[PDB]
Amino acid sequence: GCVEVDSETEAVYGMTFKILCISCKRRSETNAETFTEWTFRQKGTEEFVKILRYENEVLQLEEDERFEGRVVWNGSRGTKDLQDLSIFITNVTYNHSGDYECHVYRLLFFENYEHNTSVVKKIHIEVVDKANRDMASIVSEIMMYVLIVVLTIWLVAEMIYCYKKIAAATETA
Amino acid sequence: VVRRGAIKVLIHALFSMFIMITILTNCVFMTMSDPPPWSKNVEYTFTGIYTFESLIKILARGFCVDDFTFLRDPWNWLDFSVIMMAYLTEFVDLGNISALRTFRVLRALKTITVIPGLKTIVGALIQSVKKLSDVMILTVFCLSVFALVGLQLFMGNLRQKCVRWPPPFDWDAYISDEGNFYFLEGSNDALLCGNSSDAGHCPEGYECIKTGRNPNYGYTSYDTFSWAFLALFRLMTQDYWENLFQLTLRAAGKTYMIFFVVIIFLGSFYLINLILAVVAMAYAEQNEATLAEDKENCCAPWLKFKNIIHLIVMDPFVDLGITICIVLNTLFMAMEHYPMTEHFDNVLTVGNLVFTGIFTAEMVLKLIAMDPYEYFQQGWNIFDSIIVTLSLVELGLANVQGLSVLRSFRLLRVFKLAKSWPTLNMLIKIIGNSVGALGNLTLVLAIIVFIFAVVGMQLFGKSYKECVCKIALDCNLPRWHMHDFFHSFLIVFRILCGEWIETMWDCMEVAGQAMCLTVFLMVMVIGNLVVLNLFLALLLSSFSGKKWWTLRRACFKIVEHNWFETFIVFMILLSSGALAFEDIYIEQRRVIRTILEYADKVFTYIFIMEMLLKWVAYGFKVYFTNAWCWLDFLIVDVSIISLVANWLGYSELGPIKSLRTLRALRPLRALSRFEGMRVVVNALLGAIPSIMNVLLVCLIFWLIFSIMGVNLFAGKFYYCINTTTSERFDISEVNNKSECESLMHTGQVRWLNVKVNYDNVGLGYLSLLQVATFKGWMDIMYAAVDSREKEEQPQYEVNLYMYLYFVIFIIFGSFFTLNLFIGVIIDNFNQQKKKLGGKDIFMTEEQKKYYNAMKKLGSKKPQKPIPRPQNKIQGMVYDLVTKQAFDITIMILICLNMVTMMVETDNQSQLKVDILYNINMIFIIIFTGECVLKMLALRQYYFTVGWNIFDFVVVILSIVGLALSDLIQKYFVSPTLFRVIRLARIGRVLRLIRGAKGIRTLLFALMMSLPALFNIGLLLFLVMFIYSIFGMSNFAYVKKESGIDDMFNFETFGNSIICLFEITTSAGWDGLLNPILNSGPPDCDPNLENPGTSVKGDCGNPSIGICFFCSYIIISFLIVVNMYIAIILENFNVATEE
Ligand SMILES: *[C@@H]1O[C@H](CO)[C@@H](O[C@@H]2O[C@H](CO)[C@@H](O[C@@H]3O[C@H](CO)[C@@H](O)[C@H](O)[C@@H]3O)[C@H](O)[C@H]2NC(C)=O)[C@H](O)[C@H]1NC(C)=O
Ligand SMILES: COCC(CCO[C@H]1CC[C@@]2(C)C(=CC[C@H]3[C@@H]4C[C@@H]5O[C@]6(CC[C@@H](C)CO6)[C@@H](C)[C@@H]5[C@@]4(C)CC[C@@H]32)C1)COC
């Protein structure tokens, strides 16, 4: 169904990057119609400038300043229900580092009344120029080779313990 | 004297034939609602015959004094009670409320007096109840202890609903309003919610508040102990229990599954096999007690014609040429299907005329061959002659198209294989007894089902039609009512199949809770006791270079060694427990994902480096002749194809993603390792050569009902729906396929199909498997009835008499087949026990030392240990505890401690809580004051006896359950943790059963049977575990429909060990299978994007779902039936070893 996954925080300069904003409704059976609103703070003081407004169908209204042509919608397409509002940056620069917020503005449709809600998800990304891989993809790759090598030495110690045991018991007979 | 004359009429055997025709014509006039006014005299003529029988019996037995001796024979009490109450009706009714008509139904019990032999059966059906007294005390003690626990745990939880928040008699008129509750589409109860992070959550804009009406009609809740007695009685009998399972877990949360695992085991499965083993011990003693008493034109050239035809008949290769010609007829009918070309259709018209022409020409030669005098004497030739006649009657019509059950009677030629195949000969002998030697015990069964159809009709049938609108929102009658005769028969037939709770709610709503609990529980107790007896009766009459070698020697001692085996058994379980984490939440958690990707390469190195260590140690030929070592070799070889091709080449497409789903079989390595799983597997494998005899009959015998279904129902399940309002049109405007198809241009209209239908012999087999296990059978029956023709829109009750197709299959393909199946196993397990070196099956060698040391504990009894101390002050205390009236004091104080628990209720009073807290507080004081006056008086012997050890813990813990009530106020919220500590004062009640010897033997058998039953339970769990991982990888992303909600799903492993637990009781798998079966739009969507995953799509896979569920219904049926044999064969052994 719908799983809320957090976004990645390390971006690579010159490459592309995708910022996940997954907002799942509590009962997946209920109708809704949503839109959204992305705000972005630099490493500057305290501003949060609106950068886009994905309202509905394939129209996406954006472009105040600083980047036109390098932001693409990669969320839900042709639904109006939404539930996935992931932006996608082509050709990351060093001025895309900072703090992002997606504002989901749902409007639930019930059998007699309309109920307007709002969610905010906060995303903090970093532009580097050399992708550090992980920290659990270093420690677990070490611990695989450590466990494999220690388990063979647990055999070959025991294999040569018993091989010296049997030939010495042949000496006694 | 006229008295000497009336004896000659009484004994005269034509008079007993005249009372027989009197009743059987009265039983037709009871069998009709709204009789015409031809009946007023006919009601009196029957009274004219029964009163003459009473005069002819009093005048025959003697004088006016004899009217006492006429009433000495207690079957005459019912003959006299008939004519008295009829006369009251005649005089007039003091109160004409008209439930006195059902006393006239007591005339149908005069058949027990008339028909010879039916009196001695009712005198034995009542005799097998006498032995049932001990079990009935225990099975009502245990429904009442479990009802206390259930009440305590879920009191008030079922009323929780999901209420919104107000747009500004304020509060209580906002709660009461049904516009503020949340209803799912097409449902008439409100959605049920939970406070926890575990139970169900309401949508945004709603709040899970406790106030409401309750589920169903309010007959489901757990408050008021009398309702928690019924809510847990539909768990013992397992009627629709998976709705009461999915309502307490939606309220109280999924962690309350532990309640139902104990009740489905300890209540619904152990207590049923005490009722099944005590009727069988009482039958098989009453059966044995009778055999003890039984022992103590050219006529001379026409003989040239006759003699040469008799040479063809006697010699073989025509008898072998007929039994081949039967099997090619039944394999020619089976290849009929619905979307079928007229060219393929005219093959099967021509091909079945030919096969009729063989068996007619073969039949008329036999009339010429011997003579028509000797030919009709032996049995099979009479059977052949009816089929040849019926197949020519059906051919000879050639005009009527509303009579096509007659082309399904040529299917019965498959029983001519009975003489060759000696297991199909047994299944004819089982059917043959119930018309023959046990044919009076089927008469009784038939009579009883006739009576409860009539009693139920006259009590409840007039009120279904006047109180319609309390049941159905259409204000038409429902599917299952009692307003007619045939429908009240179909209710009584459904109760014996086991589904009694759901047509009871309609009745209670319609008439009242007093009568509907009284009739529908007297059907079920009396009727299942006669069905059970018939079943038992059928069984009991069924059976009557020098250093290379040193190196190898050295390795061998590693593999045999005890640490190396304990090391790998620990690595099987981590490899298995690592499969549980592969749910849809694995894109969300990144740390456990990269751990299990690198741990997966550690484990396939251990299970290679122990394979190669085992080739060297054992041998290359001692390895490949093991067939357990084969089973480990295939699993490792799969994990190399997936590991090498992960690196390079053909990497992720097609047959490598398909080898990824075979990763679910890694738990099968554990089956070789545990000694308990091997003793069970070696015994279930010892039963396969005899099981495959029976399973070939059930495939053969259900293929007749499958082809009979395709002849009747193929093509007749399609129907046209208004897509927006979502109900099907009436016949008045859209009767045809070619008239729904001219309404496709408005886009409001769709021509669809029932999912599980009869378009093939394959799909017949899956429609017959839902009717046979009684889950899913209602949608099939509701549409089989409605059906009209090949492309025609159904109508609501055209074709009403079909239900008998499903009635005939359940008696034959289920009851008789079941009987055939059980009788094979018991004669299998007796010869596998006599023959086997191990005396007892299903126990290991280490357990039989635990077994015999546990049999000694229940056989020892002292009657002089331990005199007491001698003191003046301290020694006067034990003087009264030792007397008999101390225990009688406590045992009656402890049933009043039970009734102070039973009267507790949700939302009772502030004054009532304060009283019961004061009464419960003094029962701590006395039950402690009996403990101190026993412990200090019996200085050392208090801790000695195992009963008194149980007493001493309860005395301590009951005070703990009182002082903690301030500590819970000191702690957090408490619907959750305050309750569970108070469950341990129900442990006071247990000390109550210490007294009954009869019950202390029934518990003992269970204890004795505990080690054997643990060995199969490990196996059942192992197979639940493999199917839970194979469903989690396949059957997530399936569209949320009928049985797949939002809590009970295959999305995770908590969700899918819950779905697979409920199907072990075969319950509710029809709704888990129903959204798997759809693929391709509409009803399913390909390309649905699931957010936060890469797996695009919505659809289920209908070929893998059918293989999933039908494997597990067959496999777990075979496993659970072994657990019935293990319990029942132990109760016999305890009574034998007395
Ligand atoms: C599940 O949790 C929620 C929140 O903790 C519980 O909601 C609370 O329910 C009470 C009903 O007892 C609401 O009503 C309040 O009660 C007074 C009683 O006089 C009433 O007069 C007031 O109008 C007041 O609304 C209460 O508002 C509500 N709390 C909140 C924050 O909305 C709910 O009871 C829990 N579910 C269960 C089954 O316990
Ligand atoms: C000949 O000597 C052998 C002797 C014991 C033989 O007596 C047998 C009498 C029938 C009886 C009670 C026996 C074992 C299994 C019992 C069956 C288990 C099945 O379970 C059910 C319920 C669940 C359903 C799925 C179908 O199967 C019942 C219908 C079936 C059952 C209750 C019908 C009756 C059977 C014992 C041993 O002596 C030491």
Ligand SMILES: *[C@@H]1O[C@H](CO)[C@@H](O[C@@H]2O[C@H](CO)[C@@H](O)[C@H](O)[C@H]2NC(C)=O)[C@H](O)[C@H]1NC(C)=O
């Ligand atoms: C499908 O059903 C329709 C209607 O039942 C058939 O069309 C004809 O409809 C008129 C009036 O609606 C009737 O008077 C005719 O009797 C109908 N024709 C016949 C032959 O009965 C239509 O023929 C049916 N189509 C098929 C393929 O059965």
Ligand SMILES: *[C@@H]1O[C@H](CO)[C@@H](O)[C@H](O)[C@H]1NC(C)=O
């Ligand atoms: C990214 O943008 C720079 C402009 O600063 C441009 O020169 C370069 O070609 C772009 N690279 C890619 C991969 O789009």
Ligand SMILES: *[C@@H]1O[C@H](CO)[C@@H](O)[C@H](O)[C@H]1NC(C)=O
């Ligand atoms: C990135 O943003 C800063 C902010 O002033 C601007 O100076 C710089 O030119 C931007 N980078 C590009 C490539 O335009």
